[PDB]
Amino acid sequence: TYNFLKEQGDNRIVRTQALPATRGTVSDRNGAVLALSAPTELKRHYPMGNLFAHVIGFTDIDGKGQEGLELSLEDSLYGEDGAEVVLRDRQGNIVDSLDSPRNKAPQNGKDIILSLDQRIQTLAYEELNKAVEYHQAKAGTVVVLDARTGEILALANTPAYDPNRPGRADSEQRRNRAVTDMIEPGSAIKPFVIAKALDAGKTDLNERLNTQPYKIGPSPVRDTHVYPSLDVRGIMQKSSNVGTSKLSARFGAEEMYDFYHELGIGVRMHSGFPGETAGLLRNWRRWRPIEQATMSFGYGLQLSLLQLARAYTALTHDGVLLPLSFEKQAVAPQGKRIFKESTAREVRNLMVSVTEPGGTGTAGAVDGFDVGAKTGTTRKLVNGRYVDNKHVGTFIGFAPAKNPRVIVAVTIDEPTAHGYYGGVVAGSPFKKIMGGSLNILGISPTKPLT
């Protein structure tokens, strides 16, 4: 009759039964579901497969975050499991619900709206893969940012994996390269050096400097071609190592160090993503003049592609460096003033000349727009030393150049076929991703289509 009152037997077993919380859902900025849980316990589903593989990561068999945003957001995503005490029989039938202070309802996890746009993510995914496959590269990465808010609109690496089946996935497939890997920025750092020299009035628009190759003691500093003299525009346009290192040489070692530091080089971003690289910025007290010089053209210091993309917000957001967001923002976060509005505006105008006839990155030109960009290729560093065959090409820029809306950054790792230069290998995916992104965002061309 009253089973609850009786001694336990083989046919009446007191059981504490889990009432599992529903894990938070992850969405794109427009409402599209990217991660959700379904009963089986609960099971995690990524409807879009490998598209947001690195950003979102995965959970373990117990519904705990293991990698990506699943790991770093674990606290608000999980919720709180509930429980109830029941009397069951040997088949598992609930015979009685038992009075207990242990009976608790579950609290579902909190839902997250990412700042990322699946339209832009798709476009970045497809073009990245096309470039990697064509150039027979080992790997690649793309970051797309909102140039005014610092919101991440897209972030993909290849090779990737299906987060619905993370068990077969390699270490190399699982690595979120945009956030975990530091690279030499090479030519990509140059606009910052030029911007600094302009900002502090160490140079101006119409100074012509001697850009002949020279020596810092024994070690030579040269360009690809001899340019007797160039103005600041020429230095930008031709990506002159000589002009850049000379401009940098007008500041002390400490002052250049503080600057690279304020740009985010050599510390963790604290973006909220797990496994962030700290990068590399050697203590200024150890710099010789040659080292200051090679740093000025992007050797001897390192940062992730995500850090590089972020530094570009100082150029696009009128001299104010923005923190990045993976979460949808109502409004631009407060940033840190790096250059005057006046300087950034001038420097954006200068960078347009790298993508026009005469510049070093004409392949990143987008029909109907002025694009400011830099591009280059460095030899790959494998444990503080160089390999033989192996290069890393990068292309980064923004549009519309006068009033920027989008930053796109692409890196291609170990291209093997059909070129080595960043301007070609990372330039076409840049071009397609940029143009597609401007179109998705409803941004009007500023000049007629050729």
From Swiss-Prot:
Name where it's found.
Cell inner membrane
The outcome of changing residue 443 to V is: In strain: CDC84-060418
The pathway is:
Cell wall biogenesis; peptidoglycan biosynthesis
Q: What class of enzyme is it?
A: hydrolase
Q: Which gene encodes it?
A: penA
What further fact does the record state? This protein was sequenced in penicillin-sensitive strains LM306, and FA19, and in penicillin-resistant strains CDC84-060384, CDC84-060418 and CDC77-124615. The sequence shown is that of strain LM306.
GO molecular function list? penicillin binding; peptidoglycan glycosyltransferase activity; serine-type D-Ala-D-Ala carboxypeptidase activity
Give the enzyme's EC designation.
3.4.16.4
Q: What is this protein called?
A: Probable peptidoglycan D,D-transpeptidase PenA
Q: What Pfam families does its record include?
A: PBP_dimer, Transpeptidase
Q: What does this protein do?
A: Catalyzes cross-linking of the peptidoglycan cell wall at the division septum.
| PANTHER family for this protein | PEPTIDOGLYCAN D,D-TRANSPEPTIDASE, PEPTIDOGLYCAN D,D-TRANSPEPTIDASE FTSI
Which species? Neisseria gonorrhoeae
Q: How does it sit in the membrane?
A: Single-pass membrane protein
Which key words tag this protein in UniProt? Answer: Antibiotic resistance, Carboxypeptidase, Cell cycle, Cell division, Cell inner membrane, Cell membrane, Cell shape, Cell wall biogenesis/degradation, Hydrolase, Membrane, Peptidoglycan synthesis, Protease, Septation, Transmembrane, Transmembrane helix
